Amino acid sequence: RNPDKVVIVGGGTAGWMTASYLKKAFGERVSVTLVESGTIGTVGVGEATFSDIRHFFEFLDLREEEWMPACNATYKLAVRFQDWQRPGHHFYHPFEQMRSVDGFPLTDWWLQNGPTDRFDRDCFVMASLCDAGRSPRYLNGSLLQQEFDPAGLTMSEHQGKTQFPYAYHFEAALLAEFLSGYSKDRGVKHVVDEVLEVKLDDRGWISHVVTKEHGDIGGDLFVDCTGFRGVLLNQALGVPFVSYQDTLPNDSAVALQVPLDMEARGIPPYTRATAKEAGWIWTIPLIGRIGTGYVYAKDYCSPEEAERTLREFVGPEAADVEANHIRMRIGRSEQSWKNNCVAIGLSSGFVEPLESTGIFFIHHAIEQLVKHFPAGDWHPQLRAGYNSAVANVMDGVREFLVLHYLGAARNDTRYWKDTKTRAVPDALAERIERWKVQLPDSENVFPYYHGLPPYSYMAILLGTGAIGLRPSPALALADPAAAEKEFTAIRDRARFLVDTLPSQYEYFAAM
Amino acid sequence: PDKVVIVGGGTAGWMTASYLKKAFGERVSVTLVESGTIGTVGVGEATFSDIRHFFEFLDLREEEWMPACNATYKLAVRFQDWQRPGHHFYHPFEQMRSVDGFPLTDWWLQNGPTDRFDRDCFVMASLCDAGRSPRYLNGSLQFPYAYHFEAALLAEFLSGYSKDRGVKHVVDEVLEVKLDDRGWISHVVTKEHGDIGGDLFVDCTGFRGVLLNQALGVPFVSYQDTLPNDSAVALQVPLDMEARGIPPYTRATAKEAGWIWTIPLIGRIGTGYVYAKDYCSPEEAERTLREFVGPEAADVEANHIRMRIGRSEQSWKNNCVAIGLSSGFVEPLESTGIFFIHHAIEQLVKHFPAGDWHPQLRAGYNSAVANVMDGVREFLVLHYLGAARNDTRYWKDTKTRAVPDALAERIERWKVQLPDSENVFPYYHGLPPYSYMAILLGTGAIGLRPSPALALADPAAAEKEFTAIRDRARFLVDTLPSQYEYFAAM
Ligand SMILES: Cc1cc2nc3c(=O)[nH]c(=O)nc-3n(C[C@H](O)[C@H](O)[C@H](O)COP(=O)(O)OP(=O)(O)OC[C@H]3O[C@@H](n4cnc5c(N)ncnc54)[C@H](O)[C@@H]3O)c2cc1C
Ligand SMILES: Cc1cc2nc3c(=O)[nH]c(=O)nc-3n(C[C@H](O)[C@H](O)[C@H](O)COP(=O)(O)OP(=O)(O)OC[C@H]3O[C@@H](n4cnc5c(N)ncnc54)[C@H](O)[C@@H]3O)c2cc1C
Ligand SMILES: [Cl-]
Ligand SMILES: [Cl-]
């Protein structure tokens, strides 16, 4: 009858997303205490989200009016992949549902007889808005419809049935500060101190966390949000961490924060991923500045050269700003939940920000935490269900990311030559063989949930260009009519939206 | 044009012929060869949640085909006496509702109003108990309801539909299937129409499997080690449906050595006894069925059937694809027979070999077909593993029989975790997570727990949703007409 006590260790994005979500879900029925270090800094990045993100704010009962201005937040409709196939060309991976004609996806029709040479513009409306720098909403908060006009879906069904599950760019520090206010206004205890030790009982479970100036803080469930450190799960409980470095070599990153005149430049409604000599560079647009970073493998490029490459790429306005060098831990823990300790965030695992899935992992974890929340005698099946769910999301996204590099047609430097000599898991090698003949569907991809629908695999395959696809033979005998009218309908609405929608700065100037 | 030759014309063949001709047409040539001495099986009266998409693909409105086939509506399947004598529950064609991330059945396990989950969580469960029509007397209406109909009448209707679009029809005996060098099919030899050749051959010859199983020697994987029901005896009983109404559902009444189906049609009921030989002989299986229906079924002829339970090792070999009973079959507990056909012909259009036969296309089709069979099979075993009835030797053996290691493990999860999208059969097999919920909750031999989180959650949003369902049901029952009144008007 006494409220279960949850102790959260870490004041990063993971920690406050957990505290606010847990407190919103259970209210005063659950006591939440968040302990964070005052000397240890947060990772400083993580500023683009995934198609899942809208569900998180809806669960928190937060409208865009309340949180977006305080975080310098902007809209994200897609990820623009630049120069991944050949110099000077780009394609979008949009957060938009794939339309089908007579049981066949529009991309399959596009392979038979597509209008233009860009699959993304023909099959996705969002690709036209991105190329025009358009805001998804008119000057009155009206989404893609001039006149005005919610939904109770879970996270998975949101990104599965919502036609336009767009995302956001935002400052990772401002969001954490906002969620700290959201949490503390709902009864979340805040303790700023260092956790010196994790005291375990006789049976190996966490008894309490030993702080320096606040004594022993105990509880029933301990949540590790200490980042790459893994203070509780990896260090204290000794849960082994498995690396993904063998399939995804990128281990390093260097990032800047560049204040720019977001007016002459404009605010592009997407994250850009420009392919480079030893990796790729991200461009995350915000209100007032852009967040840019070079994700690379240091075996192909020195940290010194990587920073200079990044500064040249942005230009003179980034010549003197501080550069943040990060050594990434790529992979995941063998299990994210052992005994009474569950890791959420960088402590659980991480893959390179190629598709901005970092915050997605956190969002998925806390949702699965509520779903598999213990209150009785802790049934092993509950913990097993959580660990398999979290691992499948990680393992699935990892396949999707390797596919980016196996599909890349770029082949100039040693880094991009080695991307095809590197050994892949046998599972993905077989699906690629299936995908060459049978364009990816719900039955030839990774079987368990991992946030990626078939049209995502379609977009990366069609856009990166090295893996040749074919249109299914049935479309050579089908009446192309209906498909050509669907192609026309997409082109028509796109032309209407581009000519009627405002830029983002215009939208954000109108409060 | 690509030449497709279909052997067999008993629902499997005509659904294939009409679907292909509507999908492609003129750019594909279809020839159907059916025996004029060998008949259809000839049952298959109830359908599944997929069936509406089939008629929509054929561009057929309900009024075009339903009266011609004596068709009625199927809102659910009523499982009777599977847990205890006199108790029943429904497995409806209605989406499960979610409150704060948890399915309504999970909330019901925590603090449900009534002792009947189906009445609390499903609206149509109230309509079934009240014998309501899903449509008003003026045609008004996610509810993927199915149909009951005469399989014989639908076959003739589709034949007309097929031949009205260029499907070449031949009535003759296929006496031989001649194989070329590779082992593919050159042509089939008829009795007096000569050889009929083509590029693709479709085996729809039923349990015989003349083309796939006999001519090409594709092995058959038996499911009888986990599903012993191998026999069936069926009747067609003309009735004054006005007196006792037309139920908007298929009933599955558990019996001493199996179960009995009751399929309501226009002017008659389709009913049969699915059973296992070791527990019941065909003669007393007939006796039981007649006593179950009554004096109205004392003189009507009885159709005895030896069922082949399982699936072919592969349904597509070389240039031959088997569709229907030739591909595989499981007992009609959930009416998945025509669903298997509808799925197969849809996969056939998807994996159509208009291109010069890539092995990956054939591999994809066989995987889709096999997993639907394996998934449904797992779902049907759950009916018997979950059934609390324990009176006869037949029902006691359902708890000592062999159980797939995969099933046994995810059952142990379901007892705690409850069926979701991540702990069921991971590939498409027509059954959503809420279908598994209904069977477990209804049959009652397998106990379940609510999620421990719901003990700490605010019930307000859930209690509101239960009330919203009961209110909508109360209104619908009071305003909707009988299913009989509906068809009597139209
Ligand atoms: C280069 C890089 C780029 C990224 N890009 C993206 C992106 O584009 N989109 C996206 O969604 N995600 C991205 N991510 C991931 C994202 O940044 C993280 O998931 C999130 O921002 C922070 O997760 P975290 O709190 O676990 O990490 P951290 O910021 O490291 O959290 C650590 C917290 O725990 C505290 N702490 C640590 N040890 C102790 C201790 N003994 N005692 C007390 N407190 C302690 C620390 O003080 C700190 O508050 C990126 C990550 C990196 C490294
Ligand atoms: C007891 C029982 C109950 C069932 N209940 C349901 C239900 O409730 N709901 C549902 O959806 N499905 C049900 N089914 C399945 C359903 O009956 C079938 O899916 C469908 O109705 C018939 O499939 P078929 O054409 O492959 O079989 P068949 O009817 O046997 O087709 C055989 C055809 O091929 C011809 N033929 C055979 N050999 C030759 C030859 N050498 N040469 C030329 N022609 C040949 C025959 O003349 C015949 O026309 C049930 C099946 C059984 C046995
Ligand atoms: Cl990321
Ligand atoms: Cl069936």
Residue numbers in the entry:
A (entry chain A): 4 to 152, 158 to 519
B (entry chain B): 6 to 146, 171 to 519
Copy text verbatim from the article accompanying this structure deposition.
Flavin‐dependent halogenases are potentially useful biocatalysts for the regioselective halogenation of aromatic compounds. However, there are a number of flavin‐dependent tryptophan halogenases that can regioselectively halogenate free tryptophan, and therefore have more potential for synthetic purposes. Previously, X‐ray structures have been elucidated for the tryptophan 7‐halogenases, PrnA9 and RebH,10 as well as a tryptophan 5‐halogenase PyrH.11 These structures provided insights into the mechanism and regiocontrol of flavin‐dependent halogenases. It is suggested, that the halogenases utilise O2 to oxidise FADH2 giving C4a‐hydroperoxyflavin, which then reacts with chloride to produce HOCl.
From this, we found that SttH from Streptomyces toxytricini gave good expression in Escherichia coli and catalysed the halogenation of tryptophan to give exclusively 6‐chlorotryptophan. The X‐ray structure of SttH was then determined at 2.7 Å to reveal a dimer, with each monomer exhibiting a box and triangular pyramid structure, as previously observed with PrnA, RebH and PyrH. At the interface with the triangular pyramid, are the catalytic residues K79 and E363, which align with the active‐site lysine and glutamate of PrnA and PyrH. In addition, SttH residues H96 and F98 are positioned for π‐stacking with the indole moiety of the substrate, whilst the P97 carbonyl and Y463 hydroxy groups can potentially hydrogen bond with the indole NH. Other than residues between SttH G148 and G167, which lack electron density in the SttH structure, the only differences evident in the active‐site region between the structures of PyrH and SttH are those of PyrH residues F451, E452 and T453 and SttH L460, P461 and P462. Each of these residues was mutated in SttH to the corresponding residue in PyrH, that is, L460F, P461E and P462T.
